[PDB]
C-alpha positions as a Markdown table, in Angstrom:
| # | Residue | x | y | z |
|---|---|---|---|---|
| 1 | Glu | 17.3 | 19.9 | 2.3 |
| 2 | Ile | 19.2 | 18.6 | -0.8 |
| 3 | Asp | 21.3 | 20.6 | -3.2 |
| 4 | Val | 20.8 | 19.8 | -7.4 |
| 5 | Ser | 24.2 | 19.8 | -8.1 |
| 6 | Tyr | 24.6 | 16.3 | -6.1 |
| 7 | Val | 20.9 | 15.3 | -8.4 |
| 8 | Lys | 20.5 | 13.8 | -11.5 |
| 9 | Ile | 17.2 | 12.8 | -13.2 |
| 10 | Glu | 17.0 | 9.7 | -15.3 |
| 11 | Glu | 13.8 | 8.1 | -17.3 |
| 12 | Val | 10.3 | 8.4 | -16.2 |
| 13 | Ile | 9.0 | 5.5 | -13.6 |
| 14 | Gly | 5.3 | 6.7 | -12.8 |
| 15 | Ala | 2.5 | 9.4 | -13.2 |
| 16 | Gly | 2.1 | 11.2 | -9.8 |
| 17 | Glu | -0.6 | 13.9 | -8.6 |
| 18 | Phe | 1.3 | 16.9 | -9.0 |
| 19 | Gly | 3.7 | 15.5 | -11.8 |
| 20 | Glu | 6.4 | 13.0 | -12.7 |
| 21 | Val | 8.0 | 10.3 | -11.0 |
| 22 | Cys | 11.5 | 9.5 | -12.3 |
| 23 | Arg | 14.3 | 7.1 | -11.5 |
| 24 | Gly | 18.0 | 9.3 | -10.9 |
| 25 | Arg | 21.2 | 9.4 | -8.8 |
| 26 | Leu | 22.1 | 11.1 | -5.4 |
| 27 | Lys | 25.9 | 11.7 | -4.8 |
| 28 | Ala | 26.3 | 13.5 | -1.6 |
| 29 | Pro | 29.9 | 14.2 | -0.1 |
| 30 | Gly | 31.2 | 11.9 | 2.2 |
| 31 | Lys | 29.0 | 9.0 | 0.6 |
| 32 | Lys | 28.7 | 6.8 | -2.7 |
| 33 | Glu | 26.8 | 7.4 | -5.5 |
| 34 | Ser | 22.9 | 5.9 | -4.6 |
| 35 | Cys | 19.8 | 5.4 | -6.5 |
| 36 | Val | 16.9 | 7.6 | -6.1 |
| 37 | Ala | 13.3 | 8.2 | -6.9 |
| 38 | Ile | 12.7 | 11.7 | -7.8 |
| 39 | Lys | 9.0 | 13.3 | -7.6 |
| 40 | Thr | 8.4 | 16.6 | -9.3 |
| 41 | Leu | 6.0 | 19.3 | -9.4 |
| 42 | Thr | -1.3 | 25.7 | -8.2 |
| 43 | Glu | 0.2 | 27.4 | -4.8 |
| 44 | Arg | -2.3 | 24.9 | -2.7 |
| 45 | Gln | -1.0 | 22.0 | -4.6 |
| 46 | Arg | 3.1 | 22.6 | -3.7 |
| 47 | Arg | 1.8 | 22.9 | 0.1 |
| 48 | Glu | -0.2 | 19.5 | -0.7 |
| 49 | Phe | 2.8 | 18.1 | -2.8 |
| 50 | Leu | 5.5 | 19.1 | 0.4 |
| 51 | Ser | 3.0 | 18.0 | 2.9 |
| 52 | Glu | 3.8 | 14.0 | 1.6 |
| 53 | Ala | 7.4 | 14.8 | 2.2 |
| 54 | Ser | 6.2 | 16.1 | 5.4 |
| 55 | Ile | 4.3 | 13.1 | 6.4 |
| 56 | Met | 7.0 | 10.7 | 5.2 |
| 57 | Gly | 10.0 | 12.2 | 7.3 |
| 58 | Gln | 8.0 | 11.4 | 10.4 |
| 59 | Phe | 8.1 | 8.0 | 9.5 |
| 60 | Glu | 11.1 | 5.3 | 10.2 |
| 61 | His | 10.0 | 1.7 | 9.5 |
| 62 | Pro | 11.6 | -1.0 | 7.0 |
| 63 | Asn | 8.2 | -1.1 | 5.2 |
| 64 | Ile | 7.5 | 2.4 | 4.7 |
| 65 | Ile | 9.3 | 4.3 | 1.5 |
| 66 | Arg | 12.3 | 6.2 | 3.1 |
| 67 | Leu | 12.6 | 9.9 | 2.3 |
| 68 | Glu | 16.2 | 11.0 | 1.2 |
| 69 | Gly | 15.4 | 14.5 | 1.4 |
| 70 | Val | 14.1 | 17.4 | -1.0 |
| 71 | Val | 15.1 | 20.1 | -3.1 |
| 72 | Thr | 13.5 | 23.2 | -1.5 |
| 73 | Asn | 15.4 | 26.6 | -2.2 |
| 74 | Ser | 15.7 | 25.2 | -6.2 |
| 75 | Met | 13.5 | 24.7 | -9.0 |
| 76 | Pro | 12.0 | 22.6 | -9.8 |
| 77 | Val | 11.0 | 21.8 | -6.6 |
| 78 | Met | 11.9 | 17.3 | -6.1 |
| 79 | Ile | 10.9 | 14.9 | -3.4 |
| 80 | Leu | 14.2 | 12.4 | -3.3 |
| 81 | Thr | 12.9 | 8.7 | -1.8 |
| 82 | Glu | 14.8 | 5.3 | -1.9 |
| 83 | Phe | 14.5 | 3.5 | -5.5 |
| 84 | Met | 12.3 | 0.3 | -5.4 |
| 85 | Glu | 13.7 | -1.7 | -8.5 |
| 86 | Asn | 11.0 | -3.8 | -8.8 |
| 87 | Gly | 8.0 | -0.9 | -8.6 |
| 88 | Ala | 4.4 | -1.5 | -8.4 |
| 89 | Leu | 3.6 | -4.9 | -6.7 |
| 90 | Asp | 0.6 | -5.7 | -9.0 |
| 91 | Ser | 2.3 | -5.2 | -12.0 |
| 92 | Phe | 5.5 | -7.0 | -10.7 |
| 93 | Leu | 3.2 | -9.9 | -9.7 |
| 94 | Arg | 1.5 | -10.2 | -13.0 |
| 95 | Leu | 4.9 | -10.0 | -14.8 |
| 96 | Asn | 6.5 | -13.0 | -12.5 |
| 97 | Asp | 3.1 | -14.9 | -12.8 |
| 98 | Gly | 3.4 | -18.1 | -10.8 |
| 99 | Gln | 6.9 | -17.2 | -10.1 |
| 100 | Phe | 6.9 | -17.2 | -6.1 |
| 101 | Thr | 6.1 | -19.9 | -3.6 |
| 102 | Val | 3.3 | -19.1 | -1.1 |
| 103 | Ile | 5.8 | -18.3 | 1.9 |
| 104 | Gln | 7.5 | -15.9 | -0.3 |
| 105 | Leu | 3.9 | -13.9 | -0.9 |
| 106 | Val | 3.4 | -14.7 | 3.0 |
| 107 | Gly | 6.5 | -12.5 | 3.3 |
| 108 | Met | 5.4 | -9.6 | 1.3 |
| 109 | Leu | 2.2 | -9.8 | 3.2 |
| 110 | Arg | 3.8 | -9.6 | 6.4 |
| 111 | Gly | 5.8 | -6.8 | 5.4 |
| 112 | Ile | 2.6 | -4.8 | 4.2 |
| 113 | Ala | 0.8 | -5.7 | 7.3 |
| 114 | Ser | 3.8 | -4.7 | 9.6 |
| 115 | Gly | 4.2 | -1.3 | 7.4 |
| 116 | Met | 0.2 | -0.7 | 7.8 |
| 117 | Arg | 0.8 | -1.7 | 12.0 |
| 118 | Tyr | 3.3 | 1.3 | 12.2 |
| 119 | Leu | 1.3 | 3.7 | 10.2 |
| 120 | Ala | -1.9 | 3.0 | 12.8 |
| 121 | Glu | 0.5 | 2.9 | 15.9 |
| 122 | Met | 1.7 | 6.6 | 14.2 |
| 123 | Ser | -2.4 | 7.7 | 14.4 |
| 124 | Tyr | -2.5 | 7.7 | 10.4 |
| 125 | Val | -5.3 | 6.7 | 8.3 |
| 126 | His | -3.8 | 5.4 | 4.4 |
| 127 | Arg | -7.1 | 5.3 | 2.7 |
| 128 | Asp | -5.5 | 4.5 | -0.6 |
| 129 | Leu | -3.7 | 1.0 | 0.5 |
| 130 | Ala | -3.6 | -1.2 | -3.1 |
| 131 | Ala | -1.0 | -3.3 | -4.7 |
| 132 | Arg | -0.6 | -0.6 | -7.1 |
| 133 | Asn | 0.7 | 1.7 | -4.1 |
| 134 | Ile | 3.1 | -0.9 | -2.6 |
| 135 | Leu | 6.7 | -1.0 | -3.8 |
| 136 | Val | 9.3 | -3.5 | -4.2 |
| 137 | Asn | 13.1 | -3.3 | -4.0 |
| 138 | Ser | 15.8 | -5.7 | -5.1 |
| 139 | Asn | 15.8 | -8.3 | -2.2 |
| 140 | Leu | 11.7 | -8.5 | -2.5 |
| 141 | Val | 10.9 | -6.0 | 0.5 |
| 142 | Cys | 7.3 | -4.5 | 0.1 |
| 143 | Lys | 7.1 | -0.9 | 1.2 |
| 144 | Val | 4.0 | 1.3 | 1.4 |
| 145 | Ser | 3.9 | 4.5 | -0.6 |
| 146 | Asp | 1.8 | 7.5 | -1.8 |
| 147 | Phe | 0.9 | 9.3 | 1.4 |
| 148 | Gly | -1.3 | 12.0 | -0.5 |
| 149 | Leu | -4.2 | 10.9 | 0.6 |
| 150 | Ser | -2.9 | 9.8 | 4.2 |
| 151 | Arg | -4.6 | 11.9 | 7.2 |
| 152 | Phe | -3.7 | 12.2 | 10.9 |
| 153 | Leu | -6.7 | 10.5 | 12.8 |
| 154 | Ser | -9.5 | 8.9 | 21.6 |
| 155 | Ser | -13.0 | 8.2 | 21.7 |
| 156 | Asp | -13.8 | 6.5 | 17.8 |
| 157 | Pro | -11.2 | 8.0 | 15.5 |
| 158 | Thr | -12.2 | 8.7 | 12.1 |
| 159 | Tyr | -11.1 | 11.3 | 9.4 |
| 160 | Thr | -14.4 | 12.3 | 7.3 |
| 161 | Ser | -13.5 | 13.1 | 3.5 |
| 162 | Ser | -15.5 | 15.7 | 1.2 |
| 163 | Lys | -10.9 | 10.4 | -5.4 |
| 164 | Ile | -11.8 | 7.4 | -3.8 |
| 165 | Pro | -10.5 | 3.6 | -5.0 |
| 166 | Ile | -14.0 | 1.8 | -4.8 |
| 167 | Arg | -13.0 | -1.6 | -5.0 |
| 168 | Trp | -10.3 | -1.1 | -2.5 |
| 169 | Thr | -12.4 | 0.9 | 0.2 |
| 170 | Ala | -14.5 | -0.2 | 3.1 |
| 171 | Pro | -18.4 | 0.1 | 2.7 |
| 172 | Glu | -19.0 | 2.7 | 5.5 |
| 173 | Ala | -16.0 | 4.8 | 3.7 |
| 174 | Ile | -17.6 | 4.8 | 0.6 |
| 175 | Ala | -21.2 | 5.4 | 2.0 |
| 176 | Phe | -20.4 | 7.9 | 4.7 |
| 177 | Arg | -16.9 | 9.1 | 4.3 |
| 178 | Lys | -15.8 | 7.3 | 7.4 |
| 179 | Phe | -12.0 | 6.3 | 7.4 |
| 180 | Thr | -10.5 | 4.3 | 10.0 |
| 181 | Ser | -7.7 | 1.8 | 10.4 |
| 182 | Ala | -10.5 | -0.8 | 10.1 |
| 183 | Ser | -11.3 | 0.7 | 6.5 |
| 184 | Asp | -7.4 | 0.5 | 5.9 |
| 185 | Ala | -7.8 | -3.1 | 7.2 |
| 186 | Trp | -10.7 | -4.1 | 4.6 |
| 187 | Ser | -7.9 | -2.2 | 1.7 |
| 188 | Tyr | -5.5 | -5.0 | 3.3 |
| 189 | Gly | -7.7 | -7.8 | 2.6 |
| 190 | Ile | -8.2 | -6.8 | -1.1 |
| 191 | Val | -4.2 | -6.2 | -1.2 |
| 192 | Met | -3.7 | -10.1 | 0.1 |
| 193 | Trp | -6.2 | -10.7 | -2.7 |
| 194 | Glu | -4.4 | -9.2 | -5.2 |
| 195 | Val | -1.0 | -10.8 | -3.9 |
| 196 | Met | -2.4 | -14.5 | -3.8 |
| 197 | Ser | -3.7 | -14.1 | -7.4 |
| 198 | Phe | -0.4 | -12.7 | -8.9 |
| 199 | Gly | -1.9 | -9.2 | -9.7 |
| 200 | Glu | -5.6 | -10.0 | -10.6 |
| 201 | Arg | -7.8 | -7.2 | -10.9 |
| 202 | Pro | -10.0 | -7.1 | -7.9 |
| 203 | Tyr | -13.7 | -7.9 | -8.9 |
| 204 | Trp | -12.2 | -8.6 | -12.3 |
| 205 | Asp | -13.9 | -6.2 | -15.2 |
| 206 | Met | -16.8 | -5.7 | -12.7 |
| 207 | Ser | -17.7 | -2.0 | -12.7 |
| 208 | Asn | -17.6 | 0.1 | -9.6 |
| 209 | Gln | -21.2 | 0.0 | -9.1 |
| 210 | Asp | -21.5 | -3.7 | -9.8 |
| 211 | Val | -18.7 | -4.3 | -6.9 |
| 212 | Ile | -20.9 | -1.5 | -4.5 |
| 213 | Asn | -23.9 | -4.2 | -5.4 |
| 214 | Ala | -21.8 | -7.3 | -4.8 |
| 215 | Ile | -20.5 | -6.1 | -1.3 |
| 216 | Glu | -24.3 | -5.1 | -0.5 |
| 217 | Gln | -25.2 | -8.9 | -1.6 |
| 218 | Asp | -22.8 | -10.0 | 1.3 |
| 219 | Tyr | -20.4 | -11.4 | -1.7 |
| 220 | Arg | -16.8 | -11.5 | -0.8 |
| 221 | Leu | -13.9 | -12.4 | -3.3 |
| 222 | Pro | -13.4 | -16.2 | -3.6 |
| 223 | Pro | -10.0 | -17.8 | -2.4 |
| 224 | Pro | -7.2 | -17.2 | -5.6 |
| 225 | Pro | -5.8 | -20.7 | -7.1 |
| 226 | Asp | -3.6 | -22.6 | -4.7 |
| 227 | Cys | -4.4 | -20.0 | -2.1 |
| 228 | Pro | -4.3 | -21.4 | 1.9 |
| 229 | Thr | -7.9 | -21.4 | 3.3 |
| 230 | Ser | -6.2 | -19.8 | 6.4 |
| 231 | Leu | -5.0 | -16.7 | 4.2 |
| 232 | His | -8.6 | -16.6 | 2.3 |
| 233 | Gln | -10.2 | -16.6 | 6.0 |
| 234 | Leu | -7.7 | -13.8 | 7.2 |
| 235 | Met | -9.2 | -11.4 | 3.7 |
| 236 | Leu | -12.8 | -12.8 | 5.1 |
| 237 | Asp | -11.7 | -11.2 | 8.5 |
| 238 | Cys | -10.8 | -7.8 | 7.0 |
| 239 | Trp | -14.2 | -7.9 | 4.9 |
| 240 | Gln | -16.4 | -8.1 | 7.8 |
| 241 | Lys | -19.4 | -5.6 | 6.9 |
| 242 | Asp | -19.0 | -4.1 | 10.7 |
| 243 | Arg | -15.9 | -2.1 | 10.8 |
| 244 | Asn | -15.7 | -3.3 | 14.6 |
| 245 | Ala | -15.7 | -7.0 | 13.5 |
| 246 | Arg | -12.2 | -6.5 | 11.2 |
| 247 | Pro | -9.0 | -7.3 | 12.8 |
| 248 | Arg | -6.6 | -4.6 | 13.9 |
| 249 | Phe | -3.2 | -4.7 | 12.0 |
| 250 | Pro | -1.3 | -6.0 | 15.4 |
| 251 | Gln | -3.9 | -8.7 | 15.0 |
| 252 | Val | -3.0 | -9.2 | 11.4 |
| 253 | Val | 0.9 | -9.6 | 11.7 |
| 254 | Ser | 0.5 | -12.0 | 14.5 |
| 255 | Ala | -2.0 | -14.0 | 12.2 |
| 256 | Leu | 0.5 | -14.2 | 9.4 |
| 257 | Asp | 3.5 | -15.4 | 11.9 |
| 258 | Lys | 1.2 | -18.0 | 13.0 |
| 259 | Met | 1.4 | -19.1 | 9.6 |
| 260 | Ile | 5.2 | -18.9 | 8.9 |
| 261 | Arg | 5.7 | -20.6 | 12.2 |
| 262 | Asn | 3.2 | -23.3 | 11.3 |
| 263 | Pro | 4.1 | -23.7 | 7.2 |
| 264 | Ala | 1.8 | -27.3 | 7.0 |
| 265 | Ser | -1.4 | -25.2 | 7.8 |
| 266 | Leu | -0.6 | -23.1 | 4.5 |
| 267 | Lys | -0.5 | -26.5 | 2.5 |
| 268 | Ile | -4.5 | -26.9 | 3.4 |
| 269 | Val | -6.2 | -25.4 | 0.4 |
| 270 | Ala | -9.5 | -25.8 | -1.0 |
């Protein structure tokens, strides 16, 4: 797809599954030089690495990381995507602790929910939705990234797994490997708490076993400081023990839109 002569690699920005993640340049003829993220690279791992580019290529949405192309016929094999100037959402919010308003954070979560509404519509289950896997650009637009664990799902559509993020995963997905859009809805609830608390670790320093024990006790994360009750209530809906009681991603987008429509409901805090 992309010839190496147009690619230039810069500093390492992250550590992927199959290798490094770098910042860089893409100067294709007939277009200006653009900022890109370069993902670099077992024979089965080559199929799994290129499968992520195969998935990304099928997507077209403002809240899903855009693929620029791939370096196929050359070495090293590289996947090129749009560059996200501010990187991971959790680390960005920890660094800018208390530097954004409620409506800005709601815009971020509304973006994530639209991207996730798109993924469910395309019959895909993410299974790795966390703030660290959400990327931020210069204009503060949030996009779903890392489709490595993403799987293609009539009746009750479930993906049953054989590397599970415990504190971001629904009970029935940990306990019975049952992955559905409802288990992604649970993950989104956690992302909402991570966003409203400016990158606080879900369940603090609690070990993974303490987290599994807390969820069985019916304990749910409290509203982060200055978090509107309506946003915490929406988190509690995502965290319903019964996967079927959780809201669907179009219902999540509409609940957030109602809060944007009436900014006085966000002023209500506990």
